[PDB]
Structure formats: C-alpha cells, structure tokens
Amino acid sequence: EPLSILVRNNKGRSSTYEVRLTQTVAHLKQQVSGLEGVQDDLFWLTFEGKPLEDQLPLGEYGLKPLSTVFMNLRLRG
C-alpha cells in the first residue's frame, strides 16, 4: 500500500520517498541517507517538530501522502 512523502534537507529542498506506513523510521532513514550522502547516525528526522524514533512504524506519526519530514544534521563537537 505504498505512498509518497517529502523529506526536506537543510538547504530547503524536498525529495520524494516511496514508503509504506508499516515500515519503520529506521527504514526511511536508510533511504534519505542514500539520497543526501549523509550516513544515518549523523542526522535525525522530525515531522511537525516531533522527532521520529527509528524502530517505530511511520503510521504512528500521522504521515499523510506528500507530508514533509525534515532532515536535521547532528553536530560533531
């Protein structure tokens, strides 16, 4: 039952990702990682300000078709 959501990077651009609401957030992060070049540990996703914990299904966050997840980069200090 796949749908499409948007993931916006830190430059303000949103790529489309094909997902099922039963797949985990960790699954989605491996797609964003392959597209934007960052590896999973160095960024984290949010939806309407709420962070997404990796091993929970996407449907628990109320993701709709063409919703916008945000990509935030983790500093290394």
């Binding site: 300000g49 063409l66 935030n72 983790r74 500093l75 200090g77």
Partner: protein, 315 residues
C-alpha cells in the same frame, strides 16, 4: 572441599544481596559480569580480602532486574556494562569550579558534555531516574564522574566520541520531570484558516528552527501541507525553561535577554563547543577556562531562556 567467602552484590548501590562465593570459580561463572570499585573482575577468582566487600553485578535474575529498572529507568541489557566502561575514563577527568558552576576540563572530546553539565546547573529541572538524580547532586559538588558516565550510557556514546549537545539534552530530558510542561502553537495559513497543536514533555520545551525566543512568539514561517507557507507562533507556554536551537549561525547574544547558550565553531565533521552564561556580565566557559565580556557575537547553536508562564497577546 568447597571453600567460600561472604560478599555483597548489587545493581543500584543501595540494595545489598548476601552471596556465598565459591573460591574455585571466577566471579563470572557465578554472577556474570562483575565489578569491584569499577574494576572488572569477571575473570578473577575470589581473594580472601574480598570478604564483606560490595560487588557491582549486572541484573541477571528477576529481583536485580526490577531493582535496576527502578534505579536507572532502562531495560537495556548492556546499559550497566556501558556505564562502567565510560566510568573508567570519567573518573580520571577533572571538574573545576568555573564562574560558580561545575565544568569539565578538556579531555576525550568532552566539550559537548561540558556544555550539557553547565546548562543543566542553570535550569530548574529534576530527574525521574533516581540514578540520574543522585549523580547530578554529586555533579554540582565537583564530583561529576558518575553523572558524565551515565550521560554517555543513556546517549549510547562512548568516551572519545564527538557529540551533539542538543541530542544529548534530548536523551536526558526524557528522564526529566517535564510532566507539567505545556506548549500551544498556532499555524495560521491564509488559505487553511488556523490550526492549534498542544505539545507536552520534552517537545514542549525544545524547538528546532530559530535561536530567538521572540521569533517563536511573533511568528515563524513554516511550510503548509496544502502548498503555501504558513506562520507558526506561540500561544501558551508553561515550563521552567525553553531551549531554542538552529544550525550554527552567527548570532549576537545580549545580556539580560537569555539564560545561557552554546556556540559551535567548525563544520559538521568536526567542531568545538563553548558555553556562554549570563551573570553580572557575559561569561564564556571553555572547559576549565573562563572569559568575561560585555558583548558576544559568534556561531551560536543553542540558546536557553528562563520561563514560568507566557500567554500570547495575538488573536
């Protein structure tokens, strides 16, 4: 033929358990991974001097399991093992008093941990996990070895790893007492009317987007699901503090407008944190180093603000 000694085993340093230890078997064969004053003794057979000593063990059976859960509020099997590994190194750190607060002298890339400990000491927060609360009380007295090792254990970080201050705060605030924290946001789209969302807990005190608290109160430009761009603004806030974050940009900190802040020099592959608090003047705390200044304008990434209750004047 069997010869034993009497010891105490524990997982929370409060509930002691009497144990008869066969001297012919290692502590590992009988209890699993075992520690004595932090020193790993899993492979060591009992010594006569171990009589009556207290040993740290991992919660192997059911009684220890619930005891460990009441103390640490985690079920991660590997938590106590990772806590002990970080504690080996954090005991060697120095925690000098700087500007009235306990800091951490530079070592093992602990500048992000230094900013966490400093920011915590200026916030009215309590920890629901008893292990975090006891270690925090010792931390304010210059004895922060346990607290730092716990922070690394809850964050799944090891000694020497580069770290993110806000991420680290997020892990620890899950165990904070933010039950009464309430935040109400309005999303005003000129097409799709108005929308209200209430946030609670850690989501009510943290925000990612701008460093300015006033920006949140007057209006933040947010995408709209319909296609436009709407404006998000704060309606009601009930908490002892708020934490504004943003990608490291250059920012002017004024006295009397904020509680404390963190700045970040470098890029997303390697950087350095220093902490800025506001007392009589702007204090900059870089590990063991203190620097006073009237003005500050640098690459800020986290800003904290004191708070009790705020109601918007907008409608």
């Amino acid at each position: 033929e069997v010869k034993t000694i009497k010891v105490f085993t524990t997982v929370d340093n409060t509930n002691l358990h009497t144990q008869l230890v066969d001297m012919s078997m290692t502590y590992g064969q009988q209890f699993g991974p075992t520690y004595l004053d932090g020193a790993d003794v899993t492979k060591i057979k009992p010594h006569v001097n171990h009589e009556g000593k207290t040993f740290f063990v991992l919660p192997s059976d059911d009684t220890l399991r619930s005891e460990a859960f009441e103390y640490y509020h985690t079920l991660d099997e590997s938590f106590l093992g990772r806590y002990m590994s970080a504690l080996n190194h954090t005991k060697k750190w120095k925690f000098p008093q700087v500007g009235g607060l306990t800091s951490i002298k530079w070592a093992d890339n602990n500048c992000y941990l230094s900013s966490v400990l400093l920011a915590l000491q200026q916030l009215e927060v309590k920890f629901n996990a008893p292990a975090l609360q006891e270690a925090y009380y010792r931390a304010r007295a210059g004895d922060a070895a346990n607290f730092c090792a716990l922070i690394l254990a809850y964050s799944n970080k090891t000694v020497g790893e580069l770290g993110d201050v806000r991420e680290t705060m997020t892990h620890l605030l899950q165990h904070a007492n933010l039950e009464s924290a309430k935040r109400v946001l309005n999303v005003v789209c000129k097409h799709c009317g108005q929308k209200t969302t209430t946030l609670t807990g850690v989501e009510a005190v943290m925000y990612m987007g701008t460093l300015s608290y006033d920006n949140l109160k007057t209006g933040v430009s947010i995408p709209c699901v319909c296609g436009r761009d709407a404006t998000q603004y704060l309606v009601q806030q009930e908490s002892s503090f708020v934490m504004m974050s943003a990608p490291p940009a250059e920012y002017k900190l004024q006295q009397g407008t904020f509680l404390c802040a963190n700045e970040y020099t470098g890029n997303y592959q390697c950087g350095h944190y220093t902490h800025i608090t506001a007392k009589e003047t702007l204090y900059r705390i870089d590990g063991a180093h203190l620097t006073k200044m009237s003005e500050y304008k640098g690459p800020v990434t986290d800003v904290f603000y004191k708070e009790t209750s705020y109601t918007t004047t907008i409608k």
